[PDB]
Amino acid sequence: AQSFLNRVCGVSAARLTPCGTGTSTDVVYRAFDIYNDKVAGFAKFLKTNCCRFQEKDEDDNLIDSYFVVKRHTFSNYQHEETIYNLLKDCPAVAKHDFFKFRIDGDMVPHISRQRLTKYTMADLVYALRHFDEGNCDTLKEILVTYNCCDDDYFNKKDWYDFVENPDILRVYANLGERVRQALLKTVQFCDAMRNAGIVGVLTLDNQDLNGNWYDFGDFIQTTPGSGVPVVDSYYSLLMPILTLTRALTAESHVDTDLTKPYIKWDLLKYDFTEERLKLFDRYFKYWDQTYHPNCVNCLDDRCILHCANFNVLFSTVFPPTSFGPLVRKIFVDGVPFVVSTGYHFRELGVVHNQDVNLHSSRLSFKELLVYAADPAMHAASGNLLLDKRTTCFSVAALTNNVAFQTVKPGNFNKDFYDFAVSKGFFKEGSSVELKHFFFAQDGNAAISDYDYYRYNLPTMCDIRQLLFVVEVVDKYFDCYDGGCINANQVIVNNLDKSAGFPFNKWGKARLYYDSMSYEDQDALFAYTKRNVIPTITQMNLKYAISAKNRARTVAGVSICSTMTNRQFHQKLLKSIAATRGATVVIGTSKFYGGWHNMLKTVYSDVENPHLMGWDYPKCDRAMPNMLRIMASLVLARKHTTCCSLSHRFYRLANECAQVLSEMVMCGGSLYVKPGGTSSGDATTAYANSVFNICQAVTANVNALLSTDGNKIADKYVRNLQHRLYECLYRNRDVDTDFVNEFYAYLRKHFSMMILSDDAVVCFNSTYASQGLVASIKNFKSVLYYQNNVFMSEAKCWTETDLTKG
């Protein structure tokens, strides 16, 4: 009757109100991370086996603390009670109460978990990794319950956007330490099990948003001191949220206390190798995979991705003046230079050049080059600069006055216009009308465009899913061949183009491709497999017709970077542009029936074909650094014979130091680039294609894993989903047979046509209707949590009639 409540709330503040109806359970729709031989996935199910009573405060106002009493088999009763009794003393275990109540002539046992919360961490993770601005009720509720905002914030519609309303981050960051507290308690819990000798798998949906744990129905016992928690799906599903909410922001504070001043690090310190290990051991103690703070010690490209993922997170703690080239005073001809002998990447840690020498008699052409290209001598000998127009970390002002570059208007071709209106054009109410012009720009147009790099935030990636998506994406690139080429095999169409800074003072690229013999070029190339050459990048405005008055800007990369990137990549790049019928359609012309062939190829044999196309908002400036690194690592997977392992790492490091986190020379001043692609580097149109395929693949993974496995009817796709979950979160090395099988499934039901971030998809309509391939909401969610942009469905098109492509 009602004595049930007086029994549930047992000895502690009986301010309970039923939520169900007497003694019957209360069903809810909540996100579970479940795997057990009949279904795997991370999806919203319907919970049915819990009566739920909410505590009220004094004042008879309702408080966010519930008593959740579960009903089950009489053994699971004693099993869970044994394990709890072994585990009760941990501060991170919600208080349980096991009792038996008789409904009729049946002493049925209940397990009452006390004072828990409305939503568990899985609801937070799901709500942020499956965002849908039409249906975000639980996210609004989580946000207002913990005083991150207040419901009138959601009348500011466009609140969820990252580009519009960039204040949303300040809102999400208010969950930060809450999340951080959870992490801490997890470690405690792990230690608890490892002492009590309990073996089990931790899932995110068994821990409320205070931090406490419950649900021991699937744990077992071993000899104490030798228990083992399994925390792969927990940490890796949670990873994208640690940088979204900035969980670790309480680590730059004097004693990890948010009410204390910032730590004032020594300016000259750059190592931070012990700090990263202490952070890893404080938060990810039981993550059982070696973490190399400096990725020089990594073993392959997958270990590099793994450890750079953690560096991405741990580098948001350390002062931003400690990244970038590490200079040093060398003596050449008895005169002291300051030159760069290393680098400190936010993703790769500290990297030291191998061939640095102090007393050199005279410089060669190659050394003159690699010293005129370094930003070291340039920045060291310029005025300090505090540019309060942007938020990007300015560095120096190589001049005495800022340069304000404008854009002119286009010239009018009056004769063609008069002729066009003679033939009866431009009449009022016609359909064809002028919309493309030359928009002029005022002085502060260059930097006000560079400032868009403020849309590039530190994004941590789901590592156990990225490590599978990289295998599938690499499988998309098996048809080609690549490797290093000698200096006499590279091809440079149009040698008369600018050579970057400072080389553009003395001549175009022709001068530097003429003055260095093939042996000089080859020595320079083989130098960058043992050393890091940081370079500068100019930012240039474009003068071209367009339909929108936003200024455009391209990154003029120095000749010292292109000259070597060409030799590293050109064999593969030209084997991509010379293949027909593939997924990447760079190089395929549209004339002479190229268009018809491309479309008939993308419509390969898909059974209920629809066509779909999306759009990446600010693709080049919002691209996370982990995905740029993955793109370059996929492009460098063809060097398995030409290059050694240290050579491949040092080429990757040169790529990052030159076209990822380089020093941009805008106006007349050196600023730091936070991340994202430089649009004028040697491999942009192909790195963009790799990134495009990566996002499409992960959209498919998310769409298949987040589906109620019990409702899938095709008993092959169910087993494919089960195997996919295992291959992500249970396996640790590649499973080439299943990689091939997923790639075949994708090519069957989700064929693509990819140019450098432009894409068409012919997909099986009746699968996407059942959530077995990516729809467009899946792309929206994926870009939200893995790209920090909101993709409005006004830029994505869909077409249901194939006879109009």
Ligand X SMILES: Nc1nc2c(ncn2[C@@H]2O[C@H](COP(=O)(O)OP(=O)(O)O)[C@@H](O)[C@H]2O)c(=O)[nH]1
Annotation: binding site:
206, 215, 292, 298, 303, 307, 484, 639, 642-643
Q: By CB under 6 A, tell whether 47 contacts ligand X.
A: yes
Q: How far is the CB of 401 from other proteins (least distance, A)?
A: 6
Would you state the structure tokens that stand for residue 157, as one six-digit string?
A: 């519609």
| Residue closer to other proteins, measured from CB, 134 or 334 | 334
Q: Binding pattern to other proteins, positions 518-557, x when CB under 8 A?
A: -------------------------------x--------
Which residues are part of a known binding site for Zn(2+)?
292, 298, 303, 307, 484, 639, 642-643
Query: Token match 């919360």: residue?
Result: 117
The count of residues interacting with ligand X (CB under 6 A) is: 10
Q: By CB under 8 A, tell whether 502 contacts other proteins.
A: no
Binding to ligand X, residues 492-511 (CB under 6 A):
none
Which does residue 395 bind out of Zn ion, Mg ion, other proteins, none, counting CB within 5 to 8 angstroms by kind? other proteins
**Which range binds ligand X by CB under 6 A, 47-55, 99-107, 240-248, 648-656?**
47-55
Instruction: Give buried/exposed letters for 354-372 (b at 16+ CB in 10 A, else e).
Output: eeeeeeeeeeeebbebbbb
**What is the phi-psi region of residue 533: left when phi exceeds 0, alpha when psi lies from -120 to 50, beta otherwise?**
beta
Q: How many residues does the chain have?
A: 805
| Residue closer to Zn ion, measured from CB, 203 or 564 | 564
Q: By CB under 5 A, tell whether 669 contacts Mg ion.
A: no
Which residues are part of a known binding site for Mn(2+)?
206, 215
Cα-based distances in Å from 239 to 174, 283, 397, 720: 17, 12, 38, 25
- Active-site annotation holder among 340, 661, 706, 756: 756
| Residue closer to other proteins, measured from CB, 378 or 780 | 378
Neighbours of 37 (CB within 10 A): 6
Which does residue 47 bind out of ligand X, Zn ion, other proteins, none, counting CB within 5 to 8 angstroms by kind? ligand X
Cβ contacts of residue 108 below 8 Å, gap of 6+? 71, 100, 101, 102
Q: How far is the CB of 29 from Mg ion (least distance, A)?
A: 15
Q: How far is the CB of 79 from ligand X (least distance, A)?
A: 11
| Residue closer to ligand X, measured from CB, 47 or 454 | 47
- Active-site annotation holder among 132, 522, 735, 758: 758
Q: By CB under 8 A, tell whether 389 contacts other proteins.
A: yes
Give alpha helix (H) positions in 136-285: 137-145, 168-172, 176-196, 232-244, 273-283
On the CB side of 59, CA atoms within 13 Å amount to 4
Q: Which helix (H) or strand (E) holds 6?
A: helix 3-8
Which does residue 224 bind out of ligand X, other proteins, Mg ion, none, counting CB within 5 to 8 angstroms by kind? none
Query: Token match 């040169």: residue?
Result: 654
Q: Binding pattern to ligand X, positions 71-90, x when CB under 6 A?
A: -x------------------
Q: Calculate the CA 154 to chain-centre distance.
A: 26
Q: How far apart are CA 656 and CA 632, in angstroms?
A: 9
Q: Which residue is nearest to ligand X (CB)?
A: 215
Which does residue 288 bind out of other proteins, Mg ion, ligand X, none, counting CB within 5 to 8 angstroms by kind? other proteins
The string of DSSP letters for 446-515 reads HHHHHGGGGG-------HHHHHHHHHHHHHTT-S-------TTS---S-S-S---TTGGGT--HHHHHHH
Which residues sit directly before a break in the chain (C to N > 2.5 Å)? none
Q: How far apart are CA 306 and CA 461, in angstroms?
A: 10
Q: Binding pattern to ligand X, positions 181-220, x when CB under 6 A?
A: -------------------------x-------xx-xx--
The reply to whether 756 belongs to the active site is yes
**CB of 468 closer than 8 Å to CB of 723:** no
Q: By CB under 5 A, tell whether 588 contacts Mg ion.
A: no
Integer Rg of the chain from CA: 29
Which does residue 327 bind out of other proteins, ligand X, Mg ion, none, counting CB within 5 to 8 angstroms by kind? other proteins
- Which stretches of the chain bind ligand X, using CB under 6 A? 47, 49-50, 70, 72, 206, 214-215, 217-218
Catalytic center residues: 756-758
- Residues at the site binding Mg ion, with contacts judged by CB under 5 A: 206, 215
